[PDB]
Motif scaffolding. Structure first.
Motif, PDB file in Angstrom:
ATOM      1  N   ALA A 227       1.087  -1.308   0.009  1.00 22.23           N
ATOM      2  CA  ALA A 227      -0.047   0.223   0.087  1.00 22.23           C
ATOM      3  C   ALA A 227       0.786   1.234  -0.096  1.00 22.23           C
ATOM      4  CB  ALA A 227      -0.887   0.000   1.193  1.00 22.23           C
ATOM      5  N   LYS A 228       1.984   1.314   0.741  1.00 19.73           N
ATOM      6  CA  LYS A 228       2.684   2.460   0.864  1.00 19.73           C
ATOM      7  C   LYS A 228       3.240   2.590  -0.424  1.00 19.73           C
ATOM      8  CE  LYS A 228       7.115   4.031   2.901  1.00 19.73           C
ATOM      9  NZ  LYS A 228       6.670   5.717   2.697  1.00 19.73           N
ATOM     10  N   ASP A 229       3.863   1.654  -0.963  1.00 16.10           N
ATOM     11  CA  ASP A 229       4.339   1.864  -2.200  1.00 16.10           C
ATOM     12  C   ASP A 229       3.667   2.451  -3.216  1.00 16.10           C
ATOM     13  OD1 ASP A 229       6.651   0.308  -1.223  1.00 16.10           O
ATOM     14  OD2 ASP A 229       6.249  -1.575  -2.518  1.00 16.10           O
ATOM     15  N   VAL A 230       2.411   2.060  -3.454  1.00 19.79           N
ATOM     16  CA  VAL A 230       1.593   2.552  -4.414  1.00 19.79           C
ATOM     17  C   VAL A 230       1.157   3.906  -4.006  1.00 19.79           C
ATOM     18  CG1 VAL A 230      -0.940   2.382  -5.191  1.00 19.79           C
ATOM     19  CG2 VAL A 230       0.425   0.384  -4.564  1.00 19.79           C
ATOM     20  N   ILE A 231       0.906   4.225  -2.679  1.00 16.94           N
ATOM     21  CA  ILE A 231       0.597   5.560  -2.136  1.00 16.94           C
ATOM     22  C   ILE A 231       1.750   6.739  -2.646  1.00 16.94           C
ATOM     23  CG2 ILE A 231       0.529   7.242  -0.018  1.00 16.94           C
ATOM     24  CD1 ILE A 231      -0.577   4.416   1.317  1.00 16.94           C
ATOM     25  N   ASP A 232       2.805   6.025  -2.627  1.00 19.17           N
ATOM     26  CA  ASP A 232       3.883   7.025  -2.626  1.00 19.17           C
ATOM     27  C   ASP A 232       4.262   7.344  -4.087  1.00 19.17           C
ATOM     28  OD1 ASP A 232       4.350   7.142   0.163  1.00 19.17           O
ATOM     29  OD2 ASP A 232       6.255   5.820   0.010  1.00 19.17           O
ATOM     30  N   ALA A 233       4.093   6.102  -4.821  1.00 18.48           N
ATOM     31  CA  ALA A 233       4.391   6.383  -6.330  1.00 18.48           C
ATOM     32  C   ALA A 233       3.064   7.024  -7.053  1.00 18.48           C
ATOM     33  CB  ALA A 233       4.423   4.832  -6.852  1.00 18.48           C
ATOM     34  N   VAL A 234       2.009   6.933  -6.577  1.00 21.88           N
ATOM     35  CA  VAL A 234       0.895   7.581  -7.145  1.00 21.88           C
ATOM     36  C   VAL A 234       0.751   9.067  -7.141  1.00 21.88           C
ATOM     37  CG1 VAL A 234      -1.551   7.900  -7.213  1.00 21.88           C
ATOM     38  CG2 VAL A 234      -0.737   5.475  -7.441  1.00 21.88           C
ATOM     39  N   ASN A 235       1.225   9.460  -5.698  1.00 20.26           N
ATOM     40  CA  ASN A 235       1.413  11.003  -5.216  1.00 20.26           C
ATOM     41  C   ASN A 235       2.684  11.484  -6.072  1.00 20.26           C
ATOM     42  OD1 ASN A 235      -0.616  10.533  -3.331  1.00 20.26           O
ATOM     43  ND2 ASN A 235       0.859  10.593  -1.658  1.00 20.26           N
ATOM     44  N   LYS A 236       3.555  10.762  -6.716  1.00 23.45           N
ATOM     45  CA  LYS A 236       4.418  11.563  -7.461  1.00 23.45           C
ATOM     46  C   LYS A 236       3.951  11.805  -9.091  1.00 23.45           C
ATOM     47  CE  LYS A 236       7.868   8.838  -5.101  1.00 23.45           C
ATOM     48  NZ  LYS A 236       8.960   7.639  -5.420  1.00 23.45           N
TER      49      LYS A 236
END
Lengths: 110, 110, 110
Positions: free
Chosen positions: B49-58
């Motif tokens: 989840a954190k991976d996706v959250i961080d990537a999407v936010n970029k």
């Protein structure tokens, strides 16, 4: 050596900048999936990094374009990474600046 | 008690608002990963989840900015959550409204 | 027949077009999760296709809207798939075109 344990993946569909399950894309958007499995896919499955990368890159907002005669044309998806320029025009000047309040676009009249 | 079963994850890279596998970022974008594993990463792995959250936010679209002299400058990424204002200018009036057809930006000349 | 092996999932929260872990949403954004588990969720868990689809669809940039009197109002999230129109105005003409350099918005003065 190892025991292989398969984890089912789910597909992520895209239409007009927005994501959908395989089932929603088929049933709401009326777009055929690759097969009956995709068409029934409710997104309960796992996804890979590449899946997410590809799906996310397809998403974006939709901008109304104008045609060769300046009349309203189709929308276009402003997808991840898509360049957008606010150009100065006849008797106007565009500026685009970046600050603590984010981005500010402005048109001045000459 | 439990038996721990490791599932390999894959990294998600970002450049200029768009996502890439570790391998694509290295080979197409010429950006060094953290190590040889990232550089060979084709995105077949799982993500958190954190991976996706961080990537999407970029991710986001790219807007052409103008410099201190009003001339064309670099693009900036309009990332998830980034504020964008369409400001009224010299002899113009900006309005931004929200309706069933989405968002409408308009500039009127005074 | 099979042995079921549970893999814990993590939630992905959204606020104002941006994604957050359950813990960040609670602690930084001060938004209550559904329960103590979400509030402590650091995003180490897996996610489903539907989770990603739903979370990604919520993300987008934030556009400053103007109110019934043309004065500054709240921001609105320009989420995945949201339509945006750059309308011609009083004594101006808007064009939006698509080319190899991406999208170009322009206002001309009449």
């Amino acid at each position: 050596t190892e025991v292989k344990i398969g984890a089912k993946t789910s597909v992520m569909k895209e239409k007009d900048g927005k994501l959908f399950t395989g089932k929603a894309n088929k049933e709401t958007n009326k777009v055929d999936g690759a097969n009956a499995t995709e068409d029934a896919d409710e997104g309960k499955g796992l996804v890979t990094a590449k899946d997410v990368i590809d799906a996310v890159n397809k998403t974006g907002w939709r901008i109304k374009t104008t045609d060769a005669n300046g009349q309203n044309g189709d929308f276009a998806t402003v997808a991840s990474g898509t360049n957008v320029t606010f150009a100065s025009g006849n008797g106007t000047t565009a500026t685009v600046t970046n600050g603590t309040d984010g981005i500010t676009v402005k048109y001045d009249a000459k």
